[PDB]
């Protein structure tokens, strides 16, 4: 049969082994007939990859130059899935994705589909209460999650298998009454240790409403995480931060069993760590400690940043997410070559008001980096398009969505806006409301161009 589900989206085929070349051709078969429109199959066994730079120059040159939409692969063990799937933001899918997707006659989520080992959540959706947790520990938590290949929603449905709760004193376990409350251990777990949550520690995990104080919660914590990993191969530079020196911002301020985890994930990847306090005399902490060369906080405008800058010029400033994304690169990489997401917040730019938005297109990694921006822009996210919405994010001109979100801004009473995901990313750089209809955010042809996708705008 056919169709035009995959038109005007760019498919690349890995071929692990010469064994492999059956399912090659099926899945390619599949995909050009329902209208892909480049599929292209690269054979890794065929070239000797051993010392050459495959970087992202190399993929956009090689694979280029137009966005490649989905890399389809069994293994995540080539040269350059870093490259595609922690900078690029391109998912990475199975095979199985391809005939599910023809199947199911949609463009199905690409979590559950990755084939790397360490996605040990790729089939959650998770909902993180924001009563719950401040904003520092709602980021962290965001990360790892995503880092683990699980899903984030900002409402509970019957499609979210887990909530997270601090404690059982929140206001939204009374104002709920199939999902389970869980506290973020249940994540923390499986960060730690990669490897599935059984046995007693797994219902060690879960809300239990006997847990009125706060010493049961920290036994809790000190027993699942507290005290060996499985998949010791998966991560394995353990020396990433040798000679680094970490200074942690009061301004995130974790729970403590919390910033315990935060302080052993740098210690046991051979980097020091120094906690600020608010009432710290500074001069004299970076003369105490002279090899201090990072700072992690919260927030740009931070006066201990202030302080910090002046007196150690060239300190590194980054915030927890830059931690986590050098883990995933395993490499050491100054903020100024990561993402507008590491470096610590902007002030809110928008409000909710201003700036409540939804997307099309947006698949795996790039659903998750949108969402970031609009968080730290200001404004909300919405996984459905209402007239709610005051803006609608687009990278192309397919689908429903942008058909009608186009129609409605042509009526003056909704005045809801179209625009491309380049006008978020500007806005958050620029630190300023810029205009959404200006031509540079007009262009929905960004499939043109991989230097287009979302994500590239602010590295160096």
């Keep these: 049969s056919t169709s035009l589900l995959f038109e005007q989206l760019n498919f690349l085929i890995l071929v692990a082994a010469e064994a492999e070349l059956p399912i090659a051709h099926s899945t390619r078969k599949l995909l050009m007939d329902n209208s892909c429109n480049n599929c292209q199959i690269y054979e890794l066994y065929n070239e000797n990859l051993k010392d050459v730079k495959t970087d992202k120059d190399w993929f956009m040159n090689k694979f280029g130059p137009q966005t490649v939409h989905f890399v389809i692969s069994n293994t995540i063990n080539f040269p350059f899935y870093k490259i595609v799937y922690f900078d690029l933001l391109i998912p990475v899918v199975s095979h199985t ?3 599910d997707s023809v199947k199911t006659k949609r463009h199905l989520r690409t979590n559950m589909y990755s084939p790397n080992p360490f996605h040990l959540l790729r089939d959650c959706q998770v909902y993180i209460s924001k009563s719950s947790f401040n904003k520092c520990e709602y980021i962290l938590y965001s990360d790892l999650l995503h880092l683990l290949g699980g899903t984030l929603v900002n409402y509970i449905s019957n499609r979210t298998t ?12 009374a104002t709920v009454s199939e999902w389970k409350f869980v506290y973020p251990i249940w994540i923390l777990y499986h960060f730690k240790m990669a490897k599935p949550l059984k046995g007693e520690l ?22 699942v995480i507290g005290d060996s990993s499985s998949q010791l191969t998966l991560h394995p530079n353990k020396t990433l931060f040798k000679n680094h020196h970490f200074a942690i911002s009061p301004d995130l301020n974790f729970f403590t ?14 980097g020091k760590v120094t906690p600020l306090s608010f009432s710290d005399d500074l001069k004299s902490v970076y ?73 099309t297109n947006y698949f795996g990694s790039q659903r998750f980096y949108i969402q970031r921006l609009v968080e730290i822009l200001g404004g909300l996210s919405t996984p459905e398009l209402t007239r709610k919405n005051t803006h609608l994010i687009t990278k192309s001109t397919i689908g429903k969505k942008f058909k009608v979100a186009k129609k409605w801004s042509l009526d003056p009473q909704n005045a809801i806006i179209v625009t491309n995901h380049m ?17 540079r955010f007009q262009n929905f042809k960004l499939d043109d161009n991989m230097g287009w996708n979302i994500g590239q705008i602010g590295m160096d």
């Design 97 to 99: 994705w391809v005939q």
């Design 257 to 270: 069993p919390l910033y315990w985890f935060l302080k052993g994930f740098i210690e046991d990847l051979d």
């Design 202 to 223: 797994a219902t060690l995990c879960e809300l239990d409403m006997q847990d009125t104080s706060e010493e049961q919660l920290f036994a809790k914590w000190e027993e």
């Design 287 to 359: 003369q105490a400690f002279p090899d201090i060369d990072c700072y992690i906080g919260h927030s740009a405008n931070s006066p201990i940043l202030e302080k910090t800058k002046s007196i150690k010029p060239e300190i590194h400033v980054g915030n927890v997410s830059w931690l986590f994304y050098m883990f995933a690169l395993q490499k050491f990489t100054p903020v100024s070559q990561c993402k507008l997401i590491h470096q610590p917040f902007h002030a809110k730019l928008f409000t909710s008001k201003e700036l409540t938005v939804a997307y």
């Design 162 to 173: 887990h909530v997270i709760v601090q404690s059982p004193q929140d206001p939204i376990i």
């Design 423 to 439: 006008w978020l990313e500007q806005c958050y750089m620029n630190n300023s409301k810029l205009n959404p209809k200006d031509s």
